[PDB]
């Protein structure tokens, strides 16, 4: 478990295409599976459950454009440490066949998904070919899945994770970038309500 010299930025950059992120307001019930709290920029969701992330652009970018999804620890003190799966979860028979057993973030239902094990930064990530909003919808929705509860590394939210959604071309340059905090639990509803309740 080596640290990385690099530190991927989290600055919000819409870019020359006005890149944003849309989330499905799944209310704050009890049987919730994945929700979002605009006030917290936090996404409460369950373990290995579909997490629809909407891509909003004003002007459809060029072809071959990809969308990278990376995770880093919100707290600077551990921002140098590598975000990965717990010793247990990385030993589970939850191998979809494409996603490596140590990757936190995954993509569901996208055959052209590529998982990158950056040999220089040691960082883990997942990328998929950007697609234009299918007729009927104004945005491109991507399904993500986290394979590790935020409790496995601290419980009391000792190690907060932050997801980094990058929009880059074929070569791999920055075009747009948004980020939201992520929490994998067992009651996204109850947990969102209470936290927002804390003002």
């Amino acid at each position: 478990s080596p640290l990385s010299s690099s530190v991927p930025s989290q600055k919000t950059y819409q870019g020359s295409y006005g890149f944003r992120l849309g989330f499905l307001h799944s209310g704050t019930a009890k049987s919730v599976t994945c929700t979002y709290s605009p006030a917290l920029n936090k996404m409460f969701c369950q373990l290995a459950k579909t997490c629809p992330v909407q891509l909003w652009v004003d002007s459809t970018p060029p072809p071959g454009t990809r969308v990278r999804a990376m995770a880093i620890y919100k707290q600077s003190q551990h921002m140098t440490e590598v975000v990965r799966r717990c010793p247990h979860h990385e030993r589970c028979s939850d191998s979809d066949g494409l996603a490596p057993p140590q990757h936190l973030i995954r993509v569901e239902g996208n055959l052209r998904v590529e998982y990158l094990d950056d040999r220089n930064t040691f960082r883990h990530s997942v990328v998929v070919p950007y697609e234009p909003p299918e007729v009927g919808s104004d945005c491109t929705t991507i399904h993500y899945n986290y394979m590790c509860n935020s409790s496995c590394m601290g419980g009391m939210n000792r190690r907060p994770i932050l997801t980094i959604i990058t929009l880059e071309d074929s070569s791999g340059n920055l075009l747009g970038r948004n980020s939201f905090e992520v929490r994998v639990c067992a009651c996204p509803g109850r947990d969102r309500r209470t936290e927002e309740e804390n003002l």
Binding site: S151, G154, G155, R158, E197
Partner: protein, 362 residues
Amino acid sequence: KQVSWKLVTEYAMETKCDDVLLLLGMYLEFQYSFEMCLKCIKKEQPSHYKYHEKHYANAAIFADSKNQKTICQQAVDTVLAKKRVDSLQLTREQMLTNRFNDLLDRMDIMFGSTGSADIEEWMAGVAWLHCLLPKMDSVVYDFLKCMVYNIPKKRYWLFKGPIDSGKTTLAAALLELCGGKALNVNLPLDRLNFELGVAIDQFLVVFEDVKGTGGESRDLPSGQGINNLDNLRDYLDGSVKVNLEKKHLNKRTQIFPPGIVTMNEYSVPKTLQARFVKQIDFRPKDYLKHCLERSEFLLEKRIIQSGIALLLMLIWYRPVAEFAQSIQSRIVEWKERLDKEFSLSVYQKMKFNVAMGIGVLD
């Protein structure tokens, strides 16, 4: 016609019952019909309903034998034999993990469709405890790394504080988490060599409230407690194996177990204070006191001084990695059960009440 000694032993082995009279009485209950077992269909004691059926036919005979007493012995010897053989071959960490697989194994009941404990109550105990000492979960964690490493002349912690300051509670708890025994080194010396054989094959040892000297100025009766430990330097060190002995039986030559010492602010000889790696000074905190007054259940049920309490605290704060691989699985299997059963916000509230001096459950 004849009893299956092997079977009785198999029972004691799954019960970890090293008590001839306990085992005797317990198995004898199996002598009755399992068809109308009131103790089973009511599921009160697992050590009973979980094995009665299987051991029914056997006990049915064991009850008419003329060697019940004896037959039970062997069974205990085996259990003891195992306890020994393990304290020699398994590693320290492989012992805590073995212990935890018994506490969590008990928790699987307390908090189940058969238990009788309020998971909510316990988490509160944790809350209270987590207000006793700064970074309590960390402290408890360090203690473990100090009891597993077992570094010679660095294997004992000292709790030195006033009367009713929590020192005993915490100790009593840790002692149950790792398993062990508590010895009274205050009594005479003419018969303390047996009161020491209790440390045989024990993970750790606890010397509850040791009376020293020179405390007259603080209205603390003088006792030969502290001075008795000094006469056991080779015990607390752990460099050489000392000789422990039980009443005309089992005179083991092992290396004394590590542990803690609790006393009422007496004077500690520089030759003993050196055998104490870390010294935590406890202070009577009023808010914690009142909190208990309004949270009586934490005492009546003995929770702030239970191992299961701290273990839970660990399943709560501590990362999965910290726990052994062969247990990380069962740990997450709980870190979720708790994550579900409770909420970060809810817990927050608890420690808040304790900090305010009110009942935890408000």
